[PDB]
Amino acid sequence: MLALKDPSLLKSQCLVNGRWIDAADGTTIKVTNPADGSVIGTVPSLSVATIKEAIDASAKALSGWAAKTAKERAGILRKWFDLIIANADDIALIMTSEQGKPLAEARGEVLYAASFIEWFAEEAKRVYGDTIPAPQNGQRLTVIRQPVGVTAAITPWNFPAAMITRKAAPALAAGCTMIVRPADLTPLTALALGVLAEKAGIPAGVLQIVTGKAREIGAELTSNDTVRKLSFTGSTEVGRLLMAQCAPTIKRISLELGGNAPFIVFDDADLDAAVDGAMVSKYRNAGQTCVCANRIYVQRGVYDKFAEKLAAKVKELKVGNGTEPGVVIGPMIEEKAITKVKAHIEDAVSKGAKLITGGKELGGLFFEPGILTGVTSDMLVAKEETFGPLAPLFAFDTEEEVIAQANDTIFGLAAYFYTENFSRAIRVSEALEYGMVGHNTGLISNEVAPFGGVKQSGLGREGSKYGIEEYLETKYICSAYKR
Amino acid sequence: MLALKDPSLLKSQCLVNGRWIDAADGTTIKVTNPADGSVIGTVPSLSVATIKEAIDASAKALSGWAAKTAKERAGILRKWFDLIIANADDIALIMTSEQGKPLAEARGEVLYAASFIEWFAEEAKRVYGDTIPAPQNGQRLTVIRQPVGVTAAITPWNFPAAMITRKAAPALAAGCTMIVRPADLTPLTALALGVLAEKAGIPAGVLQIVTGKAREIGAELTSNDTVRKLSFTGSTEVGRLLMAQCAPTIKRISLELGGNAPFIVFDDADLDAAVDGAMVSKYRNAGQTCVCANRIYVQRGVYDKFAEKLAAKVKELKVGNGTEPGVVIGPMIEEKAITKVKAHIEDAVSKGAKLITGGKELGGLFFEPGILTGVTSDMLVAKEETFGPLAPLFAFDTEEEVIAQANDTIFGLAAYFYTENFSRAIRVSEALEYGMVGHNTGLISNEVAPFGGVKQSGLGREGSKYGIEEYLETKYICSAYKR
Amino acid sequence: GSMLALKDPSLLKSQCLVNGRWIDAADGTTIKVTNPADGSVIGTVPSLSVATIKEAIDASAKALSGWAAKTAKERAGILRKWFDLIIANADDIALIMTSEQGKPLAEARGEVLYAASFIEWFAEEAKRVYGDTIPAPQNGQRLTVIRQPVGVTAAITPWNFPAAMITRKAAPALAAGCTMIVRPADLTPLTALALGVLAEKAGIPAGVLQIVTGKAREIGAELTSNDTVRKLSFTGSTEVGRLLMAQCAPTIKRISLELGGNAPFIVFDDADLDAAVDGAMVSKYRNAGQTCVCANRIYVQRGVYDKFAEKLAAKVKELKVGNGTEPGVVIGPMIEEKAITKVKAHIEDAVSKGAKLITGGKELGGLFFEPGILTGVTSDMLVAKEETFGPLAPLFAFDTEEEVIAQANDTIFGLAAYFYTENFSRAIRVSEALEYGMVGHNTGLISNEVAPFGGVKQSGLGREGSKYGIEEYLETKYICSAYKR
Amino acid sequence: MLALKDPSLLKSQCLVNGRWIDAADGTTIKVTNPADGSVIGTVPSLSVATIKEAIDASAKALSGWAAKTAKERAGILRKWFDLIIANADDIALIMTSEQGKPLAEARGEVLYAASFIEWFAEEAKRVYGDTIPAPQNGQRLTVIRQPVGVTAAITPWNFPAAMITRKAAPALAAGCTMIVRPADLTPLTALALGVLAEKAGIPAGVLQIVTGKAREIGAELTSNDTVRKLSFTGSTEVGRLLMAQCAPTIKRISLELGGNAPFIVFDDADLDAAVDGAMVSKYRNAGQTCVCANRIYVQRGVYDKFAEKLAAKVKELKVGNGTEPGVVIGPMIEEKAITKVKAHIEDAVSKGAKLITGGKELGGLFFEPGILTGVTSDMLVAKEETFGPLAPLFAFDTEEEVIAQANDTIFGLAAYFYTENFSRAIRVSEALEYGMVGHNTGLISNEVAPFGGVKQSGLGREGSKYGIEEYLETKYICSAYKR
């Protein structure tokens, strides 16, 4: 058994219209611990019919949830926030168990996840409209914002709590309802957040958590007329399909998709700080975050020193079961993740790169953090996301050249650069074709800043003063009056 | 010939990379006057190969246009605005000639169209970014807003100037370039606007205007990686396809599509003002618009009086060639449109409605403004857009019923209602599921307020403080510093 | 011996909070706090000296650097702890408040939750102090606007809302990263000290918030002359705000003021008449009529004048007057005998000029005064120009919208105004025409934390609450940075 | 006779209620040219009784001006802007003649002055209000902004055009009327703007320009009940008085007062950039601006080398009559000013400073650009503004010491610093207790950013997003409705 302070947090059922249900046909998905292969439990594999019932239940709850005051919805969301915080350790263990990441990371994610609920509880009261000077006398112009309505979220495995709250928080705050389908590999964290949602007083049908086959559930959420808005985080390939599948009813859509993050270290970097930044943006979550450094570009002058410093740190990383003290790298999520990191390694080396450390299988789903030197733009890793604990170090000579290579991608989520020079900070931060830029830091994640991509990395933003509008419609009211 | 003070405004060529060009194969589209059948001129039917050339010219021009200051882009845009106003009469004639609407409406549309250019020239200098309090010490958070890039606009025949400036003004103001494809039925106004763009000093490739097959040109614009944003106004059917076509590269998309606008008259309306608002929202552009009142809901207590008052006004509308004094209703755009109006009349009458005035062909493309009484929800006009000069008057008893009926559509563009009661004003303006609501006025159009739809009526807004952001990408910069 | 029946006795203080310590006056002198319901002495608080005030100001300056250097997130967390603690102690704060000020417990409780709401709101605002980036007119430059705390600030607060007036100033100041010195009214300092106990307990650091009691003139003179204080915020009489603004002039201090009002409450023929009577009852008789936004002049259109008066008169007859801790009591005693004299002067002037006292308006013993109503009130009566600050509804008849607009606006004041109509267009006309910072339409209660509260004309400077409140405690800094392209 | 293309721009009367008038008793103030001493002309010395009539005249005009749409006020203001830009040369000649600055600076100021009118013309249309979520059901919360009413402006001699437009443009844009009293020494530029204001279609009584004794006119403006806001730019001493004078009526008030601007050069500055920045912030207008560098702090490591490079540039400064080709330094404005500049030199040298260059009378009101080295905190120029063409170079050792010294003043208008380090830019820019900070630039002036001070440098801001609010009152409306 998992050693949970509150064992009622671990669920084998879906949350549908305020009840916990199995699949009509009793079919299930096993959830296995990537550290040891042990079966944690099962979750339902819901049918389309049941998904349709969840959608009806969402539409039925919408009226009353939307008709509450912003202050009432905010009080309920703040209770949910407080409940998550009070149960952080349990939730962290569930997550580490199903996802792999070490408990300290899991715990960090829980607090981060919780912060969007807090932040959007506060935003709910700050959904401001406008009055606008009228071009004609005898008219008054107003703009109000109202909830889009029933909404759907589809979320990935790499951040099993935080990708959920980033969508459910602003949606519920705005007065919308939401149905969430968490990834098959990591549904238990979502279910636990659902237990606490119910305990918080989020009424029946406002929030629903459904598990089952991605394609069938995804196709119903995007074809059902009642759903007015989809938010998805995951691969670009699936994002492209979902946008197409929304087109017949012109659904509002938000997408956070693939990246190919460059991480640029200039000769006048604080080099030690650049090393610490690379370590956190490359090796957090075993390299499996959307914003992870994928390509580390280091200027000729500091290349050898940077590589040598990074090796000293990579060599100290403890790999193992996430519940074990001192482990900072967990197992990878699935075997095909390992194959891909291997293919990246083997391609680079066959093109002349040197695997200077690690990058080896350690048994089961465990993989050793590693570094390549001599990496160039003709290698696979230049164009494709590794999604694993591999640091490819690309030499460069000039700022122009690095900016050109950094932007030479269909993606545009996150980028990072280190420099102490004021002017270059301006040029490079502006020239980078990315939604998010870390300057002198590898950790850019919070709830107060808008998160998202340009180009093929997605649509819309999460967090911040800009997040809630993804779940609102703007209404212009033009009123004539007798003067 | 058309009596133009500046005949060089009438073009037979496309604007590609600052040059005026014909098709490579010489092919063309004829532009006819719907009032008399005469041929005004021809425009090219460009090939996809030429469109690809125009897309590259656009990307060539972007860098230089984006690097200008906001202030310099504003100066150029104001210059354009000023040229359009100065040449308003000539533009209005080209418009009436190809499109059909009376000169006075065309003139009104030209000033309206120019107002977007003025508005967004001013908004160029007001693209504000943010500083956000950092959750951690030693960091500072900034948000800036930058041009999306190369953009495309695809525009309809019913407002052949304003639908272009609504799109091109904000794009260009933001630092984007745009390629515009106007409707085959009304391309000459677009080309006229392009001539004044050149004169304004908008550089080669920043604005380009391309004529040709809708499907082929549209397919290239939505499949070419260089194009990063599409903005389309037109049919819902075509908007669905274009969104789907944008999906493989996850393009930013703005759509303004069908409506099925309700116009609601309560017992406590200023009945006379309600009639004037009805006349203005129903018969302008001969009812040929997605914001035109399509369903006129009149509360039982005032139904008869309202019908009588509306008949007297409808019978005064003079139909004829739009260049002719006193004409306020021109020809409809094509024969298929007239048949639709006939279909709505016979369907309704066959189901119990009474055609109390007009509603018959007058020769050529001329159709006589009409009114049906006794219209109900099983009739075709309850669910389909007439796009012509027919007022269907639906009776209702209660606020609740009329709201349910107004909202019973897949669309949500414009709605209108008339009441003197303060509380009803709040209740109805908020319950109406529409992006735009006219209360005691039938005229809601301007450049300062946000225009667009909810539900299947579209994505994004035009005009207002909210319009420019459709052409901007948000960038979050997280900077660490040494305390 | 005896005590208020406090659940937590430690909330009742007899000392001032100065640099994280609870202190008496260097000379031992004190101010006595008396319960206006029965003349019993609740306790004393110190009468501090100007020298002790100067030490509080140095302490505030010393505390400022570290408090401002915290993240918005930390300051918010601390502020939210204070908020949670106020809520958790609301019944005891209410009893303290009712005991010293007079208002009924239900009203006291209501004020504490209202007070607390500013702290919650500003805790949230702290993390939302946004600056700007502005497109540069020249290439090679970048423009930024940041907002930073003004610094050491001072608040001087009245007796009519002994908790809220303090939270409405301290919450935004501290949220912004300022420190604040608060001097509350001699008549009601205990509530303010209770809030200070919970501020400490919340982790507000030594010197960041301080509460000093003593003579208004002397303490106000020091706060307004001392170079260290960069902002004053004051709520009270217009006569005092005039003095205080003059006293900030030598050093150009930032200043916020919420002063006198002369609220017109206007009932048209097309009002929902019962709802207007309810709105009148709440805006006139809450806090026994001693609120800055209380209806002062009640204008009723001739067509509904008679019906309105009869309905109001029936409600006023049911008002129960008594000790604010007694069950059912909705009118407490007035705060002091001069308040009674004024209400009596207003009655006598009105009657001398033709008005009729149709009910109430008599002394009941002690500081108790009977709610009352005048009919036939006109523009030449004193109450047309001066606030009564008592439980007296003066009913002015009017014939047209234009005439009532002109009369409403015929005042140097411009704080709150109210009006009842069901007509959409009139709502627009009247609400825009009224020369007031705050307007209630079809309601007599407009107070909350999320909208900007304050006045035009001689009713004051700046706004409290809302997205606009925190900027009263911030300075705008424009940074123009050149860079190499 | 001044060589003006349009001699109707040179006035000898006041603009009061749409009319040009003299004082009722015929008294006048002579306006002399500081370059040669000739009398340019006279202006009236209006009586208090006449000021009272302007005030009544302003109140009478308020209502009609406020009742206009923003669109309409904006058009009138843009005509005013257009007319100033068309007459720039002549306004420039008038300005150089009366206050002494070169024609090139004069022209620059007219264009700068004009930019405010253009800017607030555009802001008039963007006076936005809010809607706010109501804590109670059945209530809606609105916020609108309306004109404060009749306003007064008192303006200085050093920018005789821009200081007026900076106050009148936002006032008029907001829907206020304004009475301007310009400085005795430089009233003719005001009256010229007045001529164009009339031409522009600014209605009688909306803008008025009155000349006369400062104490008397300002006493009336500050004690008359009708005047609801005063905006004053000038000496701190007079600001302190005007603010106390406003107190008995709780008048709204904007002040921009004394500065004591520190200009800081760190060892890692771009040194020549910093010398060019110093030349421009110290020597424009002969050092007679508000925001001029008064204390030039130079880090020990680069002091002598900076002092050397500054000395080269000062030496090239052509001093002369402003109308003279190549003159970049005009006369000072009055003898009083030379006396103080001389006192600063005497005190400095007596406490050990060396006068390495210039710093002496050239006859008349001309005075030679100078530089002092060895300047220290116990000298006079450390606490008092020279307001002349004298550069005192203070040496410092550490960032911490120079921040302390920078901030060791009652003032907080403008400051400047030069550094190439990113982290230092953050620290110093945030640490400096100033309203405006130039970083690596001496030129910070424009219409789009907010200008004003902290501490005893003033209240309120001019220009930008924030400027118009100084002329608006906020009104909160809380409306109950029947659900």
- Backbone phi, psi, residue D182, to 5°: -85, 165
DSSP per-residue codes, B378-398: TSHHHHS---SSEEEEEEE--
Give A481 to chain C, closest Cα distance, Å.
Answer: 5
B401 CB-near residues (< 8 Å, 6+ apart): none
Active site positions of D, annotated: 256
Distance between CA atoms of A47 and D43, rounded to whole angstroms? 89
Q: How close does chain C come to A98, measured CA to CA in Å?
A: 32
Q: How far apart are CA C444 and CA D480, in angstroms?
A: 9
Q: Give the gap in angstroms from C-alpha A134 to the nearest C-alpha of chain D.
A: 7
| Cα B46 to Cα B214: distance, rounded to the nearest angstrom | 11
Query: Which of C133, C272, C421 to mutate to probe the B interface, most B CBs <10 Å?
Result: C133
Q: Cα(B449)–Cα(B462) distance, rounded to whole angstroms?
A: 8
Helix H, strand E, coil C: the string for chain A is CCCCCCHHHCCCCEEECCEEECCCCCCEEEEECCCCCCEEEEEECCCHHHHHHHHHHHHHHHHHHHCCCHHHHHHHHHHHHHHHHHCHHHHHHHHHHHHCCCHHHHHHHHHHHHHHHHHHHHHHCCCCEEEECCCCCCEEEEEEEEECCEEEEECCCCCCCHHHHHHHHHHHHHCCEEEEECCCCCCHHHHHHHHHHHHHCCCCCCEEECCCCHHHHHHHHHHCCCEEEEEEECCHHHHHHHHHHHHHHCCEEEEECCCCEEEEECCCCCHHHHHHHHHHHHHHHHHCCCCCEEEEEEEHHHHHHHHHHHHHHHHCCCECCCCCCCCCECCCCCHHHHHHHHHHHHHHHHCCCEEEECCCEEECCEECCEEEEEECCCCHHHCCCCCCCEEEEEEECCHHHHHHHHHCCCCCCEEEEECCEHHHHHHHHHHCCCCEEEECCCCCCCCCCCECCCHHHEECCECHHHHHHHHEEEEEEEEECCC
D467 touching C (Cβ < 8 Å)? no
Nearest to C332 by CA among C26, C35, C78, C124: C35
Tell me whether residues C439 and D241 touch, CB distance under 8 A.
no
Is residue D169 within 8 A of residue D121, CB to CB? The reply is yes
Put simply, whether A77 touches D (Cβ < 8 Å) is: no
Q: How many CB pairs under 8 A join A and B?
A: 183
CA-angle at A60, arms to A57 and A64, nearest 5°: 130
Site of tokens 């996150």: A414
CA distance, residue A431 to nearest chain C CA (Å): 11
CA distance B440 to B417: 6
Q: How far apart are CA C61 and CA C228, in angstroms?
A: 7
Q: Do B69 and C137 touch (CB under 8 A)?
A: yes
Pick the closest to residue D392 from D235, D262, D207 (CA basis).
Answer: D262
Nearest to B439 by CA among B426, B452, B450: B426
Among C420, C430, C444, C441, CA closest to C273: C420
Pairing of strands A252-256, A28-32: unpaired
State whether B483 and D427 contact (CB < 8 Å).
Answer: yes
What element of type H or E holds D67?
A: helix D48-67
DSSP state of D329: B
> What residues in C contact D425, CB-CB < 8 Å?
481
Asked if the Cβ–Cβ distance from B142 to C134 is below 8 Å, we say no
- The yes or no reply on domain C1-260+449-485 and CATH 3.40.50.620 is no
Note whether B481 contacts C: Cβ–Cβ < 8 A: no
For domain C261-448, give the CATH superfamily: Aldehyde Dehydrogenase; Chain A, domain 2 (3.40.309.10)
- The subunits that touch chain B, with at least 3 C-beta pairs less than 8 Å apart, are A, C, D
User: Contact at 8 Å (CB) between B116 and B463?
Assistant: yes
- Does the beta-carbon distance from B129 to C133 stay under 8 Å? yes
> Across the interface, do C254 and D459 touch by the CB < 8 Å criterion?
yes
Residues 265-304 of A with CB under 8 A from B: 270, 273
Helix (H, G, I), strand (E, B) or coil at D262: strand
Is D450–C248 a contact, with Cβ atoms under 8 angstroms apart? Answer: no
Please tell me which of the candidates C73, C136, C422 has its beta carbon nearest to residue B423: C422
CA–CA separation, A177 and A152 (whole Å): 8
Map tokens 């809606």 to a residue. Answer: D140
Any idea which residue has 């009529």 for tokens? C289
State both tokens at A446.
């919070």
Q: How far is C270 from chain B (nearest CA, A)?
A: 10
Q: Which of B240, B250, B435 sits opposite A257 (nearest CB)?
A: B250
Q: Per CATH, which fold does B1-258+447-483 belong to?
A: Aldehyde Dehydrogenase; Chain A, domain 1 (3.40.605)
Residue numbers in A near B461 (CB within 8 A): 474
CB atoms A435 and B228 under 8 Å: no
Residue with tokens 């695997």, as numbered in its chain: A355
- Residues in A closer than 8 angstroms to C124, CB to CB, are 122, 125
Asked if A139 has any chain C CB less than 8 Å from its own CB, the reply is no
Strand pairing category for D252-256 and D227-233: parallel
Beta bridge partner(s), residue D421: A421
Asked if C205 and C63 count as a contact pair (C-beta separation under 8 A), the reply is: yes
* Active-site choice (A118, A256, A385, A462): A256
Q: Searching chain C, which residue's CA lies closest to the CA of residue B124?
A: C135
Cα(D303)–Cα(D374) distance, rounded to whole angstroms? 10
CA–CA separation, D309 and D277 (whole Å): 12
- Across the strands, what pairs with C395? C298
Q: Where are the alpha helices (DSSP H) in B351-438?
A: 380-383, 399-406, 422-431
Q: Rounded to an integer, what distance in angstroms lies between the CA atom of residue D24 and that of residue D18? A: 17
D111 contacts chain C (CB < 8 A): no
Q: Please tell us whether the domain made up of B259-446 is placed in CATH 3.40.309.10.
A: yes
Q: Is A244 on the interface with D (CB under 8 A)?
A: no
Give the residue from B422, B423, B439 with the most C CB atoms within 10 Å of its CB, the best one to mutate. B422
Q: Are D326 and D427 in contact (CB under 8 A)?
A: no
Q: What token pair was written down for B43?
A: 């425009």
**Cβ contacts of A140 on chain C, cutoff 8 Å:** 428
> And the tokens for B449?
């307020």
Name the pairing type of β-strands C254-258 and C460-461.
antiparallel
Could B479 and D125 be called an inter-chain contact, meaning their C-beta atoms sit closer than 8 Å? Answer: no
Residue of C nearest to A482 (CA): C425
Q: Is D74 on the interface with A (CB under 8 A)?
A: no
Q: Inform me whether the C-beta atom of residue A225 falls under 8 Å from chain B C-beta atoms.
A: yes
Does A49 touch chain C if contact means CB atoms closer than 8 Å? no
Amino acid at residue number C325: T
Instruction: Pull the structure tokens for residue C64.
Output: 């400022």
Asked whether the beta carbons of D476 and C446 are under 8 A apart, the reply is yes
Task: Give domain limits for chain C.
Answer: 1-260+449-485, 261-448
